[model samples]
Target: AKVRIYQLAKELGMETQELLELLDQMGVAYKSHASTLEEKDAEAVRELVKEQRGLQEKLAEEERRKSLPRRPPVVVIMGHVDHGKTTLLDYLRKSRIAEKEAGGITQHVGAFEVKTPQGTVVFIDTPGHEARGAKVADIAVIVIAADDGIMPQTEEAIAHAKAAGAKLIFAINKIDLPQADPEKVKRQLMERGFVPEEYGGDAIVIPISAKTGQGVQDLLEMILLLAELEDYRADPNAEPRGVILESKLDKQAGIIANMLVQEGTFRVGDYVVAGEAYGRIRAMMDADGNQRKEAGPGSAVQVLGFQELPHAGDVVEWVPDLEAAKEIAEERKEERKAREEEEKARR
Candidate 1:
C-alpha cells in the first residue's frame, strides 16, 4: 500500500510543511504533499515520527506537571434533594460580603469562586436533579441532612463521587434542628463504607446549619486542607484549557459560554475550540460580571465569543489561530457524525 505525504501528515497530526522538512532530512524523495510512499517507507516514516513526537510530548507533559503551581480547589456539593447544598453555597457567597470583598459574588453561571482564609475555592453548582459537577470538581462535598440520614439520591451522589475519583467530605446540614442527628447520619454513612474520623476512619464529617452558618467555615477549611493534601496544580503559562459548564443564546449578547479554567490562562481574543464550536473570545467576565482581560486556573468565567453555543461538559481548548480552531471543530463534528451514524445502524 502507498500513502500520500499529506495523508501521512494528517494521520501523524503534523503540519504538511513540517512532514516535508522531515522527509527532506531523512533523504526521502517527495515532490510534494501528493508524493506517495511505499508500504516499507511509510512504516519507517511512521516509526520515526511516532518515536520523536511521543518522546517530545511525554517529556513536555512531565515538565509541565512538575513546574505547575498549586491552584485553588474546584469544589462541588452533592447530596439528596433538600439537603441544603444550595443553602450551603449561598452561605459561602454571603460570607464573602462579611469578609469585605464587596459585591464579588453577584451572579451564578452554574459555577462560582469564593475566597476563604485558607484560599480560594471554585464551586461548581449542580441542580438537584443533575449529577453534573462531581466529574469536573477536585473535591465533592456530600451534603446529608441531619434529620434525613441517607436516602436514595444519597447513594447516587456517593456513586458519582466515587466514580469521579474526587476527594470526599461530608457536611451534615440542619444540625440546629431539634430532630437533627448528626451521629445517626455518621453511622448510616459508615454502613455505606464511609468511616468517620472519630471512628479512626479517614472520613471528615462536619455538622452544619447552612441556614445558620454553623460549621460552614470548618467545611471551607477542610476543603482547603484536602486541596493542599491532594495538591491540585496547573500550568498558568501553558496553553489555556477548561470545561464548559453552561451556555445560552442571548438576543443582545450572542452566544455566552460559562466555563471554568482548569489550566493555564484564558485571555480575551484567544481562538479556542470547544466541542464542535470554535471562535475567538471577544469578552471575558468573572463570576461577578466584572470584566477581565484574562483569567487563570480555577476561575469561573463567562466568555462571549463562540459562533454557536457549545455543549456543557465539553472541554474548551486554546488553539493556535482561527484556522486551527476551525479545523479542530470541523474534524470533531465529522467524527461525531460518523459515530452517531454507526450507533444508529447498530440500533
Candidate 2:
C-alpha cells in the first residue's frame, strides 16, 4: 500500500515540489517526489501534521491554564466504624448530617460544603463510592477516635488515602471524652507508617472534639495551611465540563443529577452531553436547596433536567446544541450495538 510521492501530491492537490518540501520539513528523508515511501511514511506525514498542531494548541492551553484562579480544596473523611466520621462532618458543616442515620452510622455517601472565611472546604461523603472520591480528592482526613485506637477499617482507610496519593490529615476525634487517649491513637498510627508531625513523622495529626466543637478552628487552620502550599486552583473561564457525582430518577423531577463542576462555568441554559445522556440545565441548586445563577469548578450542584439518569462519575461535557447532543448519543448507541454483535458472533 506504499504510495508514491507524486501520486500523494496529486491526491492532496499539491505541486510535486511543494509536497516534497512538506515531507522534508516533517523530517522524512527523501531525494525527490518520485521516492517510494512505505505506506506508514504517508500515515506518519499525516500524524506529524496533527502533532505539530497539537503541540501549538497544548502550549497555548498551558499558558491559558496559568490564568485560572485558585479553587477550594475537596476533602474526604474516612475511618474505622463509629470513629465519629459523621460527627466530624456534622460539626464542621453545622448541619445534622448524622441525625437519623439508622443507628447513627454513615449509611451512604453524599457531599456537603462548609464555607469558611478564607474559602470553601468541600467534603466528599463516601462509603457507597469512596475510591472515586478519594482519588479525586485534594486532601483526606482519616478520623480516629481517641478511645477506639486503631480498628480494622482504620487500616483500610489509610491504604485508600495512600493509594490515592492524597495529602493525609489525621483527626483524633473525641479528645474531650474522659477516656480519650490521644497518645494511644497517635502511637497506633505510627505503627502503620504514619508518624504525627509533632513526633517528626510528617503526618499532620490534629486532636479534635467533634461533639463539643473543640479544636475545630485549629484543624481548619491546618487544612488552610496545606491548601496554601498546594495552591489548588481551577479555570472558571473554561467552557463547562464536569463529572456526575450521583444520578437517580426522581418521581417528580425526572432525572436528577448531583454533579460536581470540576472545570469551567455552567450556566442555566448550557446544553450538556453526559455519557449516554444529554440535556440542558433547566434548573440547578447548590448542595443546599438555594438556586444558583451558575456553578463552577470545585462546586457541586443539584441539576434537574437530564433526559435520563446518568450513572455515577459520568464525564459531562457541554455540546454545541441539542441536535449535536442527540447525534453523539446515537453514535454511542450504535457503537455499543456493534460491539455487542461482535462479541456475540465471537461466542
Candidate 3:
C-alpha cells in the first residue's frame, strides 16, 4: 500500500495545492479520491508520480543540451615562413592577405571567415615566425612545402599544435615546384604521428599548389566534412561568452575586436565586458562584412563600442546592465595592474 496525495504531500512538507501545481507543471494529471485513498488508488498514484518525475528529469536534460552553446571550429595555419601559409589563406579567401602586409609575411593574428556553399569556416592566420608563440586553434594546418619534406619550423609547429590539444591537418603546398615530393612529405608526417586519411588514419592530408590553385576546393570540402561530423553547435540565448582573437583601436570605429563567440548570442544593445573594457554593443558585423543584429555561436564577429581596446586572447563575457559590467571590468583592471606592478618590483 502506497500513500495518498494528501498524505504524501503532508509528509513532504508541501500543501496539496503546491503538490498539485508541481504535478501540473510536469504534465501529470490526476483525480482526487475521497478523504482517504484505497490501497489500489494509492498504488496507481505512486506509479503516476514516479512516471512524472522521470519525465521531468528527461525534459530537464533535453533543455540543458539545447541551451548549451555550439562553439565554431577554429583552424590555425602553421609552418615555415616560406611554406606558403599566407598564400594558402589568400587562395581560401580569394583576397591577397599577404600582399597587403609588409614583406609578404603575416605579422599578426589575422582572423577571417570563409563562406562556402556548405557552411562557414574560421581561419586564424598566425605568424610563421617563431617569436609570436603558438596561437590556439581548433585545428592546426601544418603547411609543409612538398619540395622540403620536413623543415625545423614545420616540426616546431607540430609540437605547438599537439601541446594546444588541436587536431592536425597536413597541407602539402608547392606541389607544382619541380622539387616537390608529396611522397617524402607524407612519410615524414607519418613518422610524426600524422597519418593521412588514405592510410586509414583520422588525420586529413590535402595537397595543393597555392600558385596554381590546385586542390583548394578539395581541401575546403574536407574541412567542412570534418566539421559536420563533429556536429558543432552553440547556443544563441545565453549571455555571450567568447575570446578576443584580435583587438585594435580604430580611428573611426573606436575599439574594434575580432571575437570568437564560443557560447551565447551577442545582440545589439547587450552590455559586453572584455578584460578591462566595458561597453554596450553598438554594432555587430560578421567576418564577411555583413552587419547583423545578433551573432550566434561559432561566429567571428567584429564588435563595435567598447570603453577601450582589449587584449587579444582575453575572454569576453556579457552582463545585463552597464553598472555590473563596469564593476567587473574595474575589478579585473585592478587585478591586472597589481600583478604587473608586483612583477616590476621583483625585477
Top candidate, metric lDDT:
1
Ranking by TM-score: 1, 3, 2
Candidate with better lDDT, 2 vs 3: 2
TM-scores, each model vs. reference: 0.78, 0.71, 0.72
Tell me how far the alpha carbon of residue 134 in candidate 3 is from the true structure, in angstroms, after superposition.
12
Candidate 2 error regions (>4 Å): 1-66, 95-110, 126-135, 333-347
Which regions of candidate 1 are displaced past 4 Å?
1-66, 99-105, 126-128, 131-135
* TM-score of candidate 3 versus the correct structure, residues matched by position: 0.72
For candidate 2, give the lDDT of residue 203: 89
Overall local distance difference test of candidate 1: 0.85
Tens digits of per-residue lDDT for model 2 on 1-347? 58888987787666888878888787788867788778888888767657876899999999977786988888878888788988887777664344454333322224676666766677776445363531357888988999888887888888888888888899999988899999988788888788888777788999998899888888887898899999988788887778777787667668788787888999888888888888888987776566788988887788878887776767888888999888887788799899999999899
lDDT ranking of the models: 1, 2, 3
- Quote the lDDT for 171 in model 2: 92
Give lDDT tens digits, candidate 3, residues 1-347: 34567886776566788777765665555686214545675455567667877899999999887655445577888888788988888787663333443333332324666667776678875343433322347777888899877987788888988888777788999999988899998898789787888999877899999888898778777878877777767667766788887787767657787777777878899998888878888987765566779877677778888888877777888898999999999999899899999999899
